[PDB]
């Protein structure tokens, strides 16, 4: 499903992303926008045989298992298919584990290139949270 901006914001807030390990809600809404335009079914195939899945484009080489990715570590202990659900539960759980790695949201290139150091709060402003 394709989330509306505020709709995803409300959902992400309910899923405890507002201020998780020091990152405000806007950071996550912004990251979702640039990673997949709020599309839970977004997928991106990579040259190394791995694929990025979901609204936060999580990779199958390190984070989830799709049963066909060379050297998969499945750090999030989940099938990549769980990351394509209209229910963002799994994508959020995994995103939290990723951000708990020593590099914060820098794990997401799109966030680094389009959200980092910006007025990310603008992404939730206007929404009734």
């Amino acid at each position, epitope marked *: 499903k394709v989330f509306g901006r505020c709709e995803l914001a409300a959902a992400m807030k309910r899923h*405890g992303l507002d*201020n*998780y390990r*020091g990152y405000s809600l806007g950071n996550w809404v912004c990251a979702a926008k640039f990673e997949s335009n709020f599309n839970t079914q977004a997928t991106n195939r990579n040259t190394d045989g791995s694929t990025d899945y979901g609204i936060l484009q999580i990779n199958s080489a*390190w984070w989830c298992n799709d049963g066909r990715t060379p050297g998969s*570590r*499945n*750090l999030c*202990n989940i099938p990549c298919s769980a990351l394509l659900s209209s229910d963002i539960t799994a994508s959020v*759980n995994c995103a939290k584990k990723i951000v708990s790695d020593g590099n914060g949201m820098n794990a997401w290139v799109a966030w680094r290139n389009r959200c980092k150091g910006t007025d990310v709060q603008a992404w939730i402003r206007g929404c009734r949270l």
Partner: antibody
């Protein structure tokens, strides 16, 4: 059949270093984040720290700079080292994966002279 | 550090009855509150993660609710094997911290 087995000196003297090994079997160290938790005599739990897939560590400030968590990907083990211990470090130590779905048996390390 | 306060300290119950355990955080932690059970001479066992998400393999009588600074672990009809310690733990901010725990004891 994922199992975590803790091992290390059950007795350490004040000012010495407490060391514990978490041997993981049925799973790989590089396939998860690993944590160390301790339970004091009165049922008080303290999260000591964890080490991520990248090797980055997060230590509880309560432990000052006495704690060190490392891993050995070839032996599939991660280790906890706590230096300059005092009787207050006497506790049951547990290792677990960051998800909290897998836990070691728990080893009581007593600090005494 | 976020302080988690659990109550009651001890809860006596007759098997078959339902009970609710409380955990309050000194600051908002969203849904980043997890519930652990720990029985005598055993390691902690994860029951509920992220306030209300069930852990595959945990009995359905266990459920969690709440958000922000107020959380509740509910046990619909406590059973014989459910007595022991229950702790809540937050993962919203480092360092992770645990509540003081609630002892579930058998009423006689």
């Amino acid at each position: 059949e994922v199992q975590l087995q803790e091992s290390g000196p059950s007795l350490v003297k004040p000012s010495q270093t407490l060391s514990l090994t978490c041997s993981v079997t049925g799973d790989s160290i590089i396939r998860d984040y690993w944590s160390w938790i301790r339970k004091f005599p009165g049922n008080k739990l303290e999260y000591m720290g964890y080490i991520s897939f990248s090797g980055n560590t997060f230590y509880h400030p309560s432990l000052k700079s006495r704690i060190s968590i490392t891993r050995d990907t070839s032996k599939n083990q991660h280790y906890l080292q706590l230096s300059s211990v005092t009787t207050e470090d006497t506790a049951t130590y547990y290792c677990a994966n960051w998800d909290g779905t897998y836990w070691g048996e728990g080893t009581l390390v007593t600090v005494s002279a | 550090d976020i302080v988690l306060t659990q109550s009651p300290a001890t809860l006596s119950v007759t098997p078959g009855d339902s009970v609710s355990l409380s955990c309050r955080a000194s600051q908002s932690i969203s849904n980043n509150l997890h519930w652990y059970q720990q029985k005598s001479h055993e390691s902690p066992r994860l029951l509920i993660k992220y306030a209300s998400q069930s852990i595959s393999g945990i009995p359905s009588r266990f459920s969690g609710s709440g958000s922000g600074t107020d959380f509740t672990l509910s046990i619909n009809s406590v059973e014989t094997e459910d007595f022991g310690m229950y702790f809540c733990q937050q993962s919203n901010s480092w360092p992770y911290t645990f509540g003081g725990g609630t002892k579930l004891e058998i009423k006689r």
